[PDB]
Write a protein that binds this ligand. Sequence first.
Ligand code: JLU
Lengths: 190, 184
Amino acid sequence: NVAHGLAWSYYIGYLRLILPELQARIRTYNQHYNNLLRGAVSQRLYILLPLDCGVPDNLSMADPNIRFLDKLPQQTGDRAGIKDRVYSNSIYELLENGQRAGTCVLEYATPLQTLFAMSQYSQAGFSREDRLEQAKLFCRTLEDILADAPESQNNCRLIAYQEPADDSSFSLSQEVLRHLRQEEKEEVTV
Amino acid sequence: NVAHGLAWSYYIGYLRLILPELQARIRTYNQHYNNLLRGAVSQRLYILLPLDCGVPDNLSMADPNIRFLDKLPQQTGDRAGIKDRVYSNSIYELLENGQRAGTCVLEYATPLQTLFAMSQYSQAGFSREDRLEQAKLFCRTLEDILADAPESQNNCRLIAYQEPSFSLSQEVLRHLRQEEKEEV
Ligand SMILES: Nc1nc(=O)c2ncn([C@@H]3C[C@@H]4COP(=O)(O)O[C@H]5[C@@H](F)[C@H](n6cnc7c(N)ncnc76)O[C@@H]5COP(=O)(O)O[C@H]4C3)c2[nH]1
């Protein structure tokens, strides 16, 4: 299917390359920038999966309480004939009542944006249900790929949610903070 | 259906973004390096499409007569939550016994690597015959998209080939020479 190929594209063309190198870049960032990403919770790549496929290019537009802080050091690699193709990731603070409640490396899964854009060219389903369904198959396929990639998969976390892009009562920052707090609770020995 | 998604992603996420800006970047390069990307033939983006989907990452190690020259100035954009995602392209000289026989911005169609990998990972359920068929469908889908694009998105040449006495540099040079003839 379409989402099946896009999930393999997302792993083969991105996650396979950047997940093994992520901790080294975070360690380099923390050494030179006063250890902003503290603890395992703040050291994963958090991948946003809006199953609505509404994907803004600026996260601050999706929620004012998500604010850009810095970039990790870039990763370069020779890729399909391009010398030093650049892979870059952005660090955000999550604000709660005007105060920083979290810090994480955060981004959208770009292929969900591709699915939506494809519908704009009348080459993929465009309806609310069709966006949700195509995104679900992509997410489940990506989940299965990562479960079969035990060597590098623990460097990322998937954050999927169904609320519409234009839903004004939905807090993306609160959605991320809920995941981060749950991750920290799993660290307690009980 | 795999190829349909990959080809549209290649257009939506790459070609539609960089082709309208490619001439300006080449012009910037040509202004500081003595119109070395000369003639209309050196102004296009050349995209290698090996139909078996075997895509080396290093072009100079694939054929020593394909020699890295320079990066174009890079192009950046905010993309899906990433600030200043970087788009970069490489210029190469094609040599014959030391003589420059052509110069161009040259690369492989990266999504062919996804088709190849799916044919090697048993979890993907994707055979070599599937790979070869989707590779042809990817090429045809991309050709259709580019044919429907504005003249601002049209400045690229797809070089599709089957490798059976094979020179990759000669494969490119044959297309560059044909274009030079259709100029005059
Ligand atoms: N966050 C994030 N940062 C990244 O740096 C990144 N790189 C990959 N990916 C993800 C894996 C998908 C497939 O990656 P890939 O196998 O390279 O296929 C590309 C390639 F053929 C071409 N292309 C695009 N950009 C470029 C470029 N700079 N240079 C050359 N060619 C370029 O367009 C296709 C579709 O790209 P898209 O962004 O839509 O989907 C990406 C999303 C990324 N994600």
